[PDB]
Amino acid sequence: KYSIGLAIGTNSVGWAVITDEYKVPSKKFKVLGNTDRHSIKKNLIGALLFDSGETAEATRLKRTARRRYTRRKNRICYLQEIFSNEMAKVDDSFFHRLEESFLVEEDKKHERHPIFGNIVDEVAYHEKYPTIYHLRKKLVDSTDKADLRLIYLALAHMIKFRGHFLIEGDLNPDNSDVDKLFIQLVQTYNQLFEENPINASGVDAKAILSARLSKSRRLENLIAQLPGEKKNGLFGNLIALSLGLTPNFKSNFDLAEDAKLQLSKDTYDDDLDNLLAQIGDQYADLFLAAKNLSDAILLSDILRVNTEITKAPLSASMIKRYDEHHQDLTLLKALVRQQLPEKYKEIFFDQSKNGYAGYIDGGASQEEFYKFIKPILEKMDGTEELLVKLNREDLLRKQRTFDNGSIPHQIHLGELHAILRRQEDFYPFLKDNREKIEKILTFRIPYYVGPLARGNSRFAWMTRKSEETITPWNFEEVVDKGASAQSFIERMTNFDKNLPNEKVLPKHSLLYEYFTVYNELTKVKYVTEGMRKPAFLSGEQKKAIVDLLFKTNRKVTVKQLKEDYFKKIECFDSVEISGVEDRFNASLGTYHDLLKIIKDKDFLDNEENEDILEDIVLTLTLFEDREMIEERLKTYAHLFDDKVMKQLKRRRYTGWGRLSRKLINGIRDKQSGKTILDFLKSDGFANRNFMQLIHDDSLTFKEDIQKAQVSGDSLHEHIANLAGSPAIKKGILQTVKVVDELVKVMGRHKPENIVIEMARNSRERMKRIEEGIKELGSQILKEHPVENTQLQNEKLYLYYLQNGRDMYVDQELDINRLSDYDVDAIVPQDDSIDNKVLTRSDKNRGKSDNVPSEEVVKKMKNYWRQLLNAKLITQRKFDNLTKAERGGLSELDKAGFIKRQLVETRQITKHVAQILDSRMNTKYDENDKLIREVKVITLKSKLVSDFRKDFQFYKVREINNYHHAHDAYLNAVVGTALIKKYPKLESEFVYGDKVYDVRKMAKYFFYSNIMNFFKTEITLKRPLIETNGETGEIVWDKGRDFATVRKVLSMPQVNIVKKTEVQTGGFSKESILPKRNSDKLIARKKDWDPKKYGGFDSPTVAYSVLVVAKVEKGKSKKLKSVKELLGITIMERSSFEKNPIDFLEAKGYKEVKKDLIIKLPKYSLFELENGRKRMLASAGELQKGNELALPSKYVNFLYLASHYEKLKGSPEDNEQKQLFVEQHKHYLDEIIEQISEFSKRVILADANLDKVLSAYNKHRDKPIREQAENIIHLFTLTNLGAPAAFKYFDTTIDRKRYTSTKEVLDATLIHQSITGLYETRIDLSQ
RNA sequence: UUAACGAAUUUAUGGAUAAAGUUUUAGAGCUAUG
DNA sequence: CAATACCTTTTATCCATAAATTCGT
DNA sequence: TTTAGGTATTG
RNA sequence: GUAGCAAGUUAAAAUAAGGCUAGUCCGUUAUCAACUUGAAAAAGUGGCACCGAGUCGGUGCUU
């Protein structure tokens, strides 16, 4: 006897309940707790507010670094382990001294100076190597033996910061002068070619080769410079090669098959010799010269500076940076003293300022310092040399900045290698471990491996050959690299939907292809002259045809079948095929790709070979890595000629299928003994399809299927599997929790109807007219100009696409009065530009029930075509405009019109329907078919949206939160209504498979716009009492039912519930905070008194706990009993739950009443005093609790007062809409007054209200549309939720926050249910 | 996901890396003047 | 106290898998 | 991308 | 301590406290009114009708 209407979003589930006659019911509810309120009445309408669900993404990102850091201290640790034994000879406590570098000297356990214990030698060190980058250049350049500590600092510093792995390959210090490298390339081609020598001449190889242009555009510029040679010529292919293009030398040598070579792709080292053996090995020397150039190009942008003197360009790059800063510092530092020496203290001494002193000592960014002194630079002479340095964005640069991520790790290795190479003569262990160290900088755990777990990671999948611990150096021997990469993909691969216990087969699987082929073929039927009736393909023909036609050719067309098989093999001269369209959809692409490679047709047909052929595709489809496939296939090498093997590694397959191996060939009917496949060929004269095979009660397949699936899943797994936003899933979980408690409410009775709905260019307008009057060539853009911000008004913008002439009358339109002109939809109500037109009168188009008439088209069938070529209209706009000459909107064209509009297309929402639909109908009748006890409906969001506008139930968001339920109410009404009149739409609108026929055009309705029947009076007659045509059920009364809808909207009591949530996540605000003598400073790691070292701050409060114990006071230390709110932080909560009391005593409580302790989750609910409500937003803060039920007349007024998007509706209706403003103009004083009684009652912020009251007084004479909108802001003051700031038109009003929580402790605590209806209240007394 | 195959973008889940930030210490502040 | 003002790590790169979405053949 | 809770200090 | 001036660009170390399963692992997502039951997963618990409407008020029958 009831129906539920849901309105789902990101932050709300809205829910209302409807009657046979569309009221919203009520009921008295029993109330628990020690309070005198023992029962209360509530309406059966509401919404459920919650904070949005959070993606795992941010979390997983924290995970990455968590991993990066525990692996970086690991890498530096490895270098120490190499050094430890040998460093100890030089310095006993060097490593210790660095470990404890961060400790204050009071806490230091060794000398304060790290590199060397003595004060004196540290001073010199920084004297001679101010930056590490200084030291690095020295360690690379000098031939002298350098101190081991110094050596260690260089290596570890490159190892701590490697730069990126975004190159695969290698790069050298020799490869910096591209010309020097270029000429060597030219030189080799010349020591090899005496008929066509080339000359280097005066080609600016350096400038041409390395520039921001395409890898292609640079290429053309090289060969342009030279004496004229073909980009296709050999030298161009080599120049091309370096540039990273794929160049094919086939045309040059006219080789039999094409062999291109790319230097980024893997196949380069292998391809070169495959080409090289035919060409001869002499030629090989050239290509390496060409690769070398590539490497010179590659780093040519990363270190643009000259690096000719040294083997350490990066550090050379830094050292030049450091000196320019020193140079430019003094030039600035002096020039400020020279002419403007008053500000110097502000710039260079005050840290807070964003001066240089701020730049270095303060936290100002390079960006902030540059901006701050650009004024000063251009107020003093000699600035310009300095300023061209600032506009360059290269001034007083730090060595280490955001920029450096650009550097490729390789360039660091070259400095480390060169450092190691230098000093290995002096220290033996370095020569031995040089290789072992280099792997540290070079090593990177490959992604397909995943984290190297020992079964203790959710995420990890890798596999190991030996259970021993993994170093960068033994990785290959312990880690099963390949079988890891299979596991890697296999976990993200789909399962088989029909039996989701077995993995999907590769889509290109040979078993898969056959199944996909035979299922299309079983349903093929042939009709011939001899036969009385059409007959299925029989068991032999499928088996013949496939051997005959599918093995011969990749794709099989129908004419191929009748001429190649039917006429040739059965000698039927004519036949007719019902079963398939113009060609067979399936194909055996692998058979042929496999047939052509192994070149053995016998090998493909022996069924004993199928187990071996599946594995080749599965390994072939799986693996990315050239090497890796081979380690797998080697088991098979014997079956095959070595040349056969070579082609197989090449073919790689992309994509995973739909179905399991087991389903197709493993499952077997206990009765028939035959598998799925074996029923797909040879089913006898009645030949069944795959769906039919699973859906045959007599066969074991439907029963065998059902067993795997139940073994189903709980709600979260059912809900979480859903595809879409992780947040809108939350509303779903809550939306279903909401229905289920609604069910509890109706005496455990189920509802008949359920209606669910979920909610979801400024310059684009300027460019589509710019180019559409450019190809029209018209001067209507020149005649009157407009701006880019203006065209969000339709009637202005539609004039411009039209060019000033009406598509219905062919005359020029006045610019000033578009008010008199109508916007016309090409098709009777679509609001897009595609279907909107502007003419003086919309009756010119013909009948208003008719498509734009033949009468107007004939004058302007040409104007609309002029507009299409100028992209001033679209194919959808035009094909609807001319549509009168295609018989107009056909009954079947009009069926496309409304049917497309109404049905929900979104795959998430659909799934929700199942979720509800399956959760309702548990009962099954004696037949297998389901009982549709409850009907689920999915409504588009627009349908209600226009109805509110059409039928005076206007929506304003920010006044209130009641509108959330109000859409749920309105969604239940429009829903139950559209299905009450038309069951023919039950199959379209409801998850229920019945079936609906398009043919009608059960006569129902002539007109194309669906939402008409509610209307008492409609724009060109309906009886006010509506009934279904076929059964006589009375469905809509235009007079009777409407009163209650406006009344229910108008209802002042709705259930608004904001879901209560223990706070999860990060412990505290992330920033490190400087040492302080505060007690709220959280220590970073144990031995660091934040007072000494700095610490954290601002912990997040997981939940509040109410305490009722005693405490010590004064030097007296007297015990007196306190009751208050304790803030359990996220860090604390783990510790708190183990022992509440011991933990409580440690925070200072004595004699806690253990039993009365209440954990108050966030958004917790209290009503105190006069029934104003407070939500606990923290242990120490509170949040607004009451929504102000603005009377319906004001909402409706304010929406029209707000004058949303000028006026969209019909213009005669608009004069009453404007009239309503003046008639209800005195309301503005009434609206403001509503707030005042409510603020004074609930908000208790009078401080603020006063600047408000003293502000509406001031702008009384300002217009209403402007005044009303600014009035709307205020409600955020009155709004449930957080104090946040709002502004009246000229004044910003700050928020009134509740920094004391005492008022709760003596109030009545409210626990409410998910609906809000069932409660337990608790009045608080110590 | 389509009446069927492909391509793309998006979002979701997952992996491997990078560069900045922040914090305490080390980078002997000197010269007049109590 | 309760106002008051102030605070709140970010920005890249590569690889995979999947739905869902809108194009194509 | 802006929220809305910490946090310390004032008249 | 106030005046004067020199100075500055780098480094090391930590990067959620930390946990045991000590792995070159894990540590911010989802999930949560209350009461009884449960290790948890979860299951259980709240008469109806009418008249009305400033955030639910009254009344009749059963209870």
Swiss-Prot record:
Region named RuvC-III: 906-1064
Key words of the record: Antiviral defense, DNA-binding, Endonuclease, Exonuclease, Hydrolase, Magnesium, Manganese, Metal-binding, Nuclease, RNA-binding
Domain of life, per lineage: Bacteria
Record entry for activity regulation: Only has nuclease activity when bound to both gRNAs (crRNA plus tracrRNA), which results in conformational changes in the protein and formation of a central channel which binds target DNA. Also requires interaction with PAM to trigger catalytic activity. Nuclease activity is inhibited by EDTA.
CDD domains: Csn1
Effect of residue 162 to A: Moderately decreased DNA cleavage
Null mutant phenotype: Loss of correct processing of pre-crRNA and tracrRNA. Loss of immunity against a plasmid with homology to CRISPR spacer sequences.
Active site per the UniProt annotation: 7, 825
Top class in the EC scheme: hydrolase
Signal peptide span: none
Record domain HNH Cas9-type: where: 761-902
Effect after changing residue 844 to A: Only cleaves 1 DNA strand, probably the complementary strand. Processes guide RNAs correctly. In vivo, loss of Cas9-mediated CRISPR interference in plasmid transformation
Subunit and interaction comment: Monomer. Binds crRNA and tracrRNA.
Domain notes: Has 2 endonuclease domains. The discontinuous RuvC-like domain (approximately residues 1-62, 718-765 and 925-1102) recognizes and cleaves the target DNA noncomplementary to crRNA while the HNH nuclease domain (residues 810-872) cleaves the target DNA complementary to crRNA. Has a bilobed architecture with a recognition lobe (REC, residues 60-718) and a discontinuous nuclease lobe (NUC, residues 1-59 and 719-1368). The crRNA-target DNA lies in a channel between the 2 lobes. Binding of sgRNA induces large conformational changes further enhanced by target DNA binding. REC recognizes and binds differing regions of an artificial sgRNA in a sequence-independent manner. Deletions of parts of this lobe abolish nuclease activity.
Designated name of the protein: CRISPR-associated endonuclease Cas9/Csn1
